[PDB]
Design a protein around this motif. Structure first.
Motif, PDB file in Angstrom:
ATOM      1  N   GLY A  12     -30.948 -29.694 -80.769  1.00 15.64           N
ATOM      2  CA  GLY A  12     -31.495 -29.469 -82.110  1.00 15.64           C
ATOM      3  C   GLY A  12     -31.903 -30.763 -82.815  1.00 15.64           C
ATOM      4  O   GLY A  12     -32.607 -30.728 -83.829  1.00 15.64           O
ATOM      5  N   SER A  13     -31.483 -31.889 -82.235  1.00 15.93           N
ATOM      6  CA  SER A  13     -31.710 -33.270 -82.605  1.00 15.93           C
ATOM      7  C   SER A  13     -30.845 -33.652 -83.814  1.00 15.93           C
ATOM      8  O   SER A  13     -30.419 -32.780 -84.577  1.00 15.93           O
ATOM      9  N   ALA A  14     -30.515 -34.948 -83.916  1.00 11.19           N
ATOM     10  CA  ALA A  14     -29.401 -35.487 -84.700  1.00 11.19           C
ATOM     11  C   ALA A  14     -29.315 -34.854 -86.100  1.00 11.19           C
ATOM     12  O   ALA A  14     -30.234 -34.968 -86.920  1.00 11.19           O
ATOM     13  N   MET A  15     -28.205 -34.157 -86.350  1.00 12.36           N
ATOM     14  CA  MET A  15     -28.057 -33.262 -87.489  1.00 12.36           C
ATOM     15  C   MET A  15     -26.939 -33.750 -88.410  1.00 12.36           C
ATOM     16  O   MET A  15     -26.603 -34.942 -88.401  1.00 12.36           O
ATOM     17  N   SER A  16     -26.382 -32.842 -89.216  1.00 14.21           N
ATOM     18  CA  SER A  16     -25.169 -33.075 -89.977  1.00 14.21           C
ATOM     19  C   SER A  16     -24.106 -33.669 -89.057  1.00 14.21           C
ATOM     20  O   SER A  16     -23.908 -33.189 -87.940  1.00 14.21           O
ATOM     21  N   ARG A  17     -23.433 -34.723 -89.524  1.00 11.43           N
ATOM     22  CA  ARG A  17     -22.183 -35.139 -88.907  1.00 11.43           C
ATOM     23  C   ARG A  17     -21.152 -34.141 -89.401  1.00 11.43           C
ATOM     24  O   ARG A  17     -20.896 -34.130 -90.610  1.00 11.43           O
ATOM     25  N   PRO A  18     -20.571 -33.309 -88.529  1.00  9.55           N
ATOM     26  CA  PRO A  18     -19.415 -32.542 -88.928  1.00  9.55           C
ATOM     27  C   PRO A  18     -18.264 -33.519 -89.133  1.00  9.55           C
ATOM     28  O   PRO A  18     -18.114 -34.481 -88.365  1.00  9.55           O
ATOM     29  N   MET A  19     -17.364 -33.233 -90.065  1.00  8.36           N
ATOM     30  CA  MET A  19     -16.079 -33.900 -90.082  1.00  8.36           C
ATOM     31  C   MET A  19     -15.030 -32.946 -90.631  1.00  8.36           C
ATOM     32  O   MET A  19     -15.340 -32.014 -91.376  1.00  8.36           O
ATOM     33  N   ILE A  20     -13.798 -33.137 -90.172  1.00 10.54           N
ATOM     34  CA  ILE A  20     -12.769 -32.111 -90.153  1.00 10.54           C
ATOM     35  C   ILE A  20     -11.489 -32.808 -90.570  1.00 10.54           C
ATOM     36  O   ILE A  20     -11.134 -33.821 -89.971  1.00 10.54           O
ATOM     37  N   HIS A  21     -10.822 -32.308 -91.603  1.00  5.03           N
ATOM     38  CA  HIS A  21      -9.639 -32.954 -92.161  1.00  5.03           C
ATOM     39  C   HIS A  21      -8.360 -32.219 -91.770  1.00  5.03           C
ATOM     40  O   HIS A  21      -7.271 -32.753 -91.947  1.00  5.03           O
ATOM     41  N   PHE A  22      -8.466 -31.014 -91.200  1.00  9.39           N
ATOM     42  CA  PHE A  22      -7.378 -30.213 -90.637  1.00  9.39           C
ATOM     43  C   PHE A  22      -6.277 -29.833 -91.649  1.00  9.39           C
ATOM     44  O   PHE A  22      -5.456 -28.969 -91.351  1.00  9.39           O
ATOM     45  N   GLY A  23      -6.257 -30.389 -92.865  1.00  7.16           N
ATOM     46  CA  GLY A  23      -5.173 -30.242 -93.828  1.00  7.16           C
ATOM     47  C   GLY A  23      -3.934 -31.059 -93.442  1.00  7.16           C
ATOM     48  O   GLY A  23      -2.867 -30.857 -94.027  1.00  7.16           O
ATOM     49  N   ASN A  24      -4.044 -31.969 -92.467  1.00  3.89           N
ATOM     50  CA  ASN A  24      -2.955 -32.785 -91.968  1.00  3.89           C
ATOM     51  C   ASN A  24      -3.019 -34.156 -92.625  1.00  3.89           C
ATOM     52  O   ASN A  24      -3.971 -34.478 -93.332  1.00  3.89           O
ATOM     53  N   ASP A  25      -2.020 -34.994 -92.380  1.00  2.34           N
ATOM     54  CA  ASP A  25      -2.102 -36.438 -92.597  1.00  2.34           C
ATOM     55  C   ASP A  25      -2.584 -37.073 -91.299  1.00  2.34           C
ATOM     56  O   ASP A  25      -3.560 -37.821 -91.260  1.00  2.34           O
ATOM     57  N   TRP A  26      -1.892 -36.750 -90.208  1.00  2.00           N
ATOM     58  CA  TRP A  26      -1.995 -37.559 -89.006  1.00  2.00           C
ATOM     59  C   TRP A  26      -3.205 -37.125 -88.180  1.00  2.00           C
ATOM     60  O   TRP A  26      -3.947 -37.965 -87.691  1.00  2.00           O
ATOM     61  N   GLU A  27      -3.454 -35.820 -88.080  1.00  2.00           N
ATOM     62  CA  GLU A  27      -4.643 -35.299 -87.411  1.00  2.00           C
ATOM     63  C   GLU A  27      -5.911 -35.654 -88.204  1.00  2.00           C
ATOM     64  O   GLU A  27      -6.954 -35.913 -87.611  1.00  2.00           O
ATOM     65  N   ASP A  28      -5.814 -35.729 -89.537  1.00  2.00           N
ATOM     66  CA  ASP A  28      -6.884 -36.178 -90.430  1.00  2.00           C
ATOM     67  C   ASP A  28      -7.215 -37.649 -90.173  1.00  2.00           C
ATOM     68  O   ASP A  28      -8.336 -37.958 -89.769  1.00  2.00           O
ATOM     69  N   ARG A  29      -6.244 -38.561 -90.352  1.00  2.00           N
ATOM     70  CA  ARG A  29      -6.467 -39.992 -90.123  1.00  2.00           C
ATOM     71  C   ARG A  29      -7.003 -40.217 -88.711  1.00  2.00           C
ATOM     72  O   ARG A  29      -7.971 -40.954 -88.556  1.00  2.00           O
ATOM     73  N   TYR A  30      -6.400 -39.572 -87.711  1.00  2.77           N
ATOM     74  CA  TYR A  30      -6.763 -39.710 -86.316  1.00  2.77           C
ATOM     75  C   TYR A  30      -8.228 -39.367 -86.148  1.00  2.77           C
ATOM     76  O   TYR A  30      -8.983 -40.161 -85.589  1.00  2.77           O
ATOM     77  N   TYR A  31      -8.624 -38.186 -86.620  1.00  2.03           N
ATOM     78  CA  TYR A  31      -9.994 -37.744 -86.555  1.00  2.03           C
ATOM     79  C   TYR A  31     -10.919 -38.788 -87.178  1.00  2.03           C
ATOM     80  O   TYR A  31     -11.816 -39.280 -86.496  1.00  2.03           O
TER      81      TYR A  31
END
Length: 113
Positions: A12-31
């Motif tokens: 589809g060619s370079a689109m929205s950067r998805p980003m995901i916070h998971f509602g976590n601290d550690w999975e959020d920072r990691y991501y």
């Protein structure tokens, strides 16, 4: 293995950067610290073959995943589980999105009203 997966897919060619916070601290920072490794693109087939989301988002996710998980793992690109489990949504986002846009592309109302 090299791109032997996509059944005649497109990008589809370079689109929205998805980003995901998971509602976590550690999975959020990691991501956030790593989200650049995951592609800003996904491989999909024309929705017309299907007409559904699942039938468009299913192995689309797998194929693109397996590309950036095998086709790139050739340069040692080693996504751990704590990576795959995040990118499992990343690739889903842009496909969910590309699907929604394409959903009016294939349809254009032009078969109903």
């Amino acid at each position: 293995s090299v791109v032997g997966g996509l059944g005649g897919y497109m990008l589809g060619s370079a689109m929205s950067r998805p980003m995901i916070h998971f509602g976590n601290d550690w999975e959020d920072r990691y991501y956030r610290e790593n989200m650049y490794r995951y592609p800003n693109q996904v491989y999909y087939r024309p929705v017309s073959q299907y007409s559904n989301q699942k039938n468009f988002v299913h192995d689309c996710v797998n194929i693109t995943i397996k590309q950036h998980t095998v086709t790139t793992t050739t340069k040692g690109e080693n996504f751990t589980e704590t990576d795959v489990k995040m990118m499992e949504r990343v690739v889903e986002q842009m496909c969910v999105t590309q699907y929604q846009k394409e959903s009016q592309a294939y349809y254009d109302g032009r078969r109903s009203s």
